[PDB]
Amino acid sequence: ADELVFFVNGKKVVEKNADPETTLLVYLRRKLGLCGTKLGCGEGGCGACTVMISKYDRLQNKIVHFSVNACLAPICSLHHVAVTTVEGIGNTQKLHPVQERIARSHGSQCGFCTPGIVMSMYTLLRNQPEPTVEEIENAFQGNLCRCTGYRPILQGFRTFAKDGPSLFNPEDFKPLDPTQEPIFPPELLRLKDTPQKKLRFEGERVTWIQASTMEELLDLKAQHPDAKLVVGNTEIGIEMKFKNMLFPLIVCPAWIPELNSVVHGPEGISFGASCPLSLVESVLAEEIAKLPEQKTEVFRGVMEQLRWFAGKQVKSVASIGGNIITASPISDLNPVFMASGAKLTLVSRGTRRTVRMDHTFFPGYRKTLLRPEEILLSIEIPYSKEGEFFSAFKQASRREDDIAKVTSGMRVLFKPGTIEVQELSLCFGGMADRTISALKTTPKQLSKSWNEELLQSVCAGLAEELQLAPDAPGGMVEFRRTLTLSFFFKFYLTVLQKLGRADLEDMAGKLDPTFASATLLFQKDPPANVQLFQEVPKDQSEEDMVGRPLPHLAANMQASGEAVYCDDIPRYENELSLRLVTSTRAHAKITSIDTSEAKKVPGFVCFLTAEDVPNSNATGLFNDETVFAKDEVTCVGHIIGAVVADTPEHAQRAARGVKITYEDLPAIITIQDAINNNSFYGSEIKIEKGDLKKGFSEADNVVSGELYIGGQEHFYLETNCTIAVPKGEAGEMELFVSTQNTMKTQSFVAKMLGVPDNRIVVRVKRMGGGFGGKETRSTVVSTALALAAHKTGRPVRCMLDRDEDMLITGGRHPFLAKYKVGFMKTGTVVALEVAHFSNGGNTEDLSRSIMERALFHMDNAYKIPNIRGTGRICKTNLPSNTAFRGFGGPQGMLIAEYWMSEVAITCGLPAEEVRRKNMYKEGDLTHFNQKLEGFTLPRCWDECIASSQYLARKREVEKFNRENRWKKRGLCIIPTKFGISFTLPFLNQGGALVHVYTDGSVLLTHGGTEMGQGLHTKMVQVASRALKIPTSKIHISETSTNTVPNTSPTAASASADLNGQGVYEACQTILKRLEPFKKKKPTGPWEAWVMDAYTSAVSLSATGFYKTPNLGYSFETNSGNPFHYFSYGVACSEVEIDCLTGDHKNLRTDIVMDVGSSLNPAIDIGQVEGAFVQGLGLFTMEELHYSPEGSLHTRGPSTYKIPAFGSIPIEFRVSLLRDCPNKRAIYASKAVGEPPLFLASSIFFAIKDAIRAARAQHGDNAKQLFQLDSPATPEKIRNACVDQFTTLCVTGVPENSKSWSVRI
């Protein structure tokens, strides 16, 4: 036929005109209106779109359930299946146990990732009602969360595990009843009695054929070799979406029995090419469990690769044949199949051949071997033989769901009874434009014994044979080469052990006992978590929730997918879609724009440019930005214009047909380019105190150095989004925006349009994360959209794709620092001079205020009598960098801790002793002359050092390092001081509006926006105490410019402080009005007083306002307080590094945080954990790469690696400091959002210690100050662990000299 029939949440869908390009995500959200399932990336990496599929499997003869990425699933692949979304399992009226548990355990903050995580856990439970803790963790390999730090999610779900004051109470969790899950649609069970026939779907550009038999597939390939095979679509979906590939004819062979068979033969196991990787995994796990070890070496090699291959959603549909035929150079399976000589069967109409995978199979970049009319039928994965050993290796940026830098399969076969090499095969991915074998090194080794001279001969060969051009795609050439040698060393040592286990230990020899840990397969301990906080007074009423662990008010709705984010709002029938058109050049003249092709796309409306702007094209915080480029473009990502079309698909197609011609201009990309060109934003910023000349002369030692700190992408799970609704009267417009800054959104729109501010209303219900990235940069979408709405008179909507968002909106400022520190032999610091440089990109934005804050925190926790700090902001042809949680603090403080670590090393004293003796005391003045009152940091230090048992663990670390050569541990304890308040004083103001209706219910609003930090929850808690009524009588619906005007951004961690005071004051006004009625009816309920007030004509509405008193610092006189108070905290972390690969484990972290008297210890601990884990990403794994021409390479989760479930400290302890009220802030609390992020430097410095231990083993001296830039990635860790393998790989750097990426 041509009707597409499937089920969604038990309801039958009949699509009479299915378009092959339509994904399930798009169909669910836009056709069925089910917006619980989210778009977070569109590329299989985040899991936000996770849904469950059920089907009757014809081959297994049973109902099966599995999870998929809705963003990648073509609906045309989904004939006769049943889809379940988050809405299908439960809702707020009846939550599923999974939804209840994630909500109540504080595992949902912003909530944008919650439905996908719910669906991952739900699918696991449908497959395994009693999972293990390990199975639960494994369920989320393809899910990301940017807010929670993962800990609460795993803790809540652990309650499901077979083998798994309080923040939450698991005894209150309702039990699971599997009989209450949705029925498998009866019609579908009826339909399995009728045979499957070929189906044909024809779309706008694409024809899709769902083949039922091999005969039909082969005929079609013979007659149309052009036909594109699609099985899982996990490559083709990406090729179509991101590489703009169009395959007009697609054939899906997934129904064909022959491509799905598993056959056990005498030589191995044959898998049909369409077999999902999940099936390959389950089949091989079975075989490994039942067969003797000696037969399963290759099976275990495949399994070791699949362990770190994507997550459950991808492996459910991704085929074994699809990975082979894709033939990416970084395939994880191809080097294993090549090294094992796996047997491939290829077929076409009338032909059949069997081939062995070897070098000839891959004759070029992303090519086989196969003829245009051939398909891969099956692959035989071999049993290993006696004397045959196998290892598989992968090293990436992150263990989980990542692209290999180097991947490898290695096989050795020994002549019987000997340790002489009969066969040897070493195959590599990531070392060429294809999977390659080391065919020049390995023949030289045949007949040799497995010994030290074989080791040295292979390493020397590999280093000569596996050369890389300085400009090789992927970069990291020294690291990649070092890994090939390091992987062979591990295989060499593993084979020695395997020979000993075969009772040839005397022939082969024993392993040095300090070498044994080098061969261990990756394993973690089970997680252990602690949360400590203070109970509220015994006499506090149960209805006073201030200081109580109240769950986020929207947690239940977030878990159910009922909470509404911008793009979940239904479209008006006349709504249009916008797509931005951006510069592909870093600095160029625009010489012409050609929209000829754009105009041919059906649904095209218009292309907006600078000419269409009614009033002003000048925008941005400092008016130095264009709404749309005029005459020139100044970064790759510079917005030139915007296409308007009927649908987002038509807008994307039209935007591709906008052809721009450029004339290149001289580009300034790097901080050095900018120094050389005197290209800066404003003048040097400077803080200086004491006498530097005297300080340096009195110093026993002086140490100079530099540090580079890489930037950071926010990766809020919800990208930037605006809907502009024009009202057709008086210039009136309403914008619904994911923004932290309603005021500037309103102002920038109004100024662009040329209307007063009173015409523009900006509304924000909630954001799926912001982290500073939506403080200003949101407006580049808002203004373009507001313009399209004005021009058309129709509502217009734009949500950015992840690749667009990462390119356009910028991130944290990269920093370069040059320091000189003077100190005594005692470790006492007497003089410090630091020059800071940041890379600001192509507009000023917040850059100068960021540098100010870096300079305010260059002391960190340390008293330094003679200090000079300067900052310069570089003006470059890069997307403009902006606010990011920390706002320059983390960079400033990392530099401080960096030279401090070198002070301790140079003195030969314990680092903790050096830090402690340099720490401020109560009453000291900072370098900017602010007095330190209520200085809790020494308490945080003493409590953390003791509770973490730092000294006893130091002993164990030193012991570990003496007993292990190729793994090292490190341990560090780091303090922090963080000033709370906007550096711009007048921004420290907040407003509220409160209404009491005649039923006694209260509607509260304030200037702060909800982005997952639980601000509305805290404000309700505050108002409930202030009014003395239960939280249940108070509701906050949204943030709006027309309820509270002139609001500061939700930023600087200040929002609870500012809005809390505003809310408190509005509530006090109301109470004052009710007092005469309270005095008359002293016990009569709240509702009586309110009705009495109303009928006496007393106003039940009030504004409230607050400004932080006594702020205002001058850089000129170094006087006045920039901050209202400081936040304090300490963290101790332990790590274990792999010296041979650069991988590491975060073993344990203990945090003690001063949050005053917490408004909400559940939310505050969640903020501590979330901030800490973002810092962990900043300092250890998050890295952005740019071409030498200033083009961002890193445009999605595939290449940009944020912390995953498996990244977090295995033991994770957080304590909130007891008995530390902060009188000056709302109910004695302190701000919490930004201060804990820098604490993750404890991991950076623990890594540095482990490297120092590794370097003490190979090399001359001693207390050498080696370089470690941030982030400390596997590349930087491995390269710093100088040994015999790095030495054979150094060769290169021919000045000068093209490279894949440049450091900005």
Ligand SMILES: Cc1cc2nc3c(=O)[nH]c(=O)nc-3n(C[C@H](O)[C@H](O)[C@H](O)COP(=O)(O)OP(=O)(O)OC[C@H]3O[C@@H](n4cnc5c(N)ncnc54)[C@H](O)[C@@H]3O)c2cc1C
């Ligand atoms: C989030 C994510 C993580 C990933 N992680 C990894 C990883 O860690 N390691 C790794 O190696 N890959 C990884 N991949 C790549 C990808 O998932 C695998 O290559 C997968 O096996 C592709 O299979 P598919 O069925 O989805 O292929 P499809 O996209 O449907 O097709 C891929 C190619 O194979 C061809 N093809 C499929 N079947 C046949 C056939 N039998 N005969 C001839 N040609 C055929 C198609 O025409 C197409 O050219 C990842 C992808 C994603 C999205």
Ligand SMILES: NC(=O)C1=CN([C@@H]2O[C@H](COP(=O)(O)OP(=O)(O)OC[C@H]3O[C@@H](n4cnc5c(N)ncnc54)[C@H](O)[C@@H]3O)[C@@H](O)[C@H]2O)C=CC1
């Ligand atoms: N999305 C994800 O999270 C993951 C996807 N996969 C795979 O990653 C692939 C990424 O595709 P692309 O971006 O097109 O990368 P690609 O397929 O072009 O491969 C890039 C890599 O190949 C190597 N390479 C290519 N040419 C080279 C040369 N001339 N010299 C030396 N080395 C060279 C380099 O190691 C480089 O990093 C996907 O197709 C997918 O199969 C694998 C892991 C994760």
Ligand SMILES: O=c1[nH]c(=O)c2[nH]c(=O)[nH]c2[nH]1
């Ligand atoms: O002092 C600050 N000002 C800001 O505007 C801001 N934004 C932010 O995320 N942190 C800070 N800090």
Ligand code: FES
């Ligand atoms: S939206 Fe599908 S994986 Fe991110």
Ligand code: FES
């Ligand atoms: S709560 Fe997980 S991304 Fe925000």
Ligand SMILES: [Ca+2]
């Ligand atoms: Ca900037």
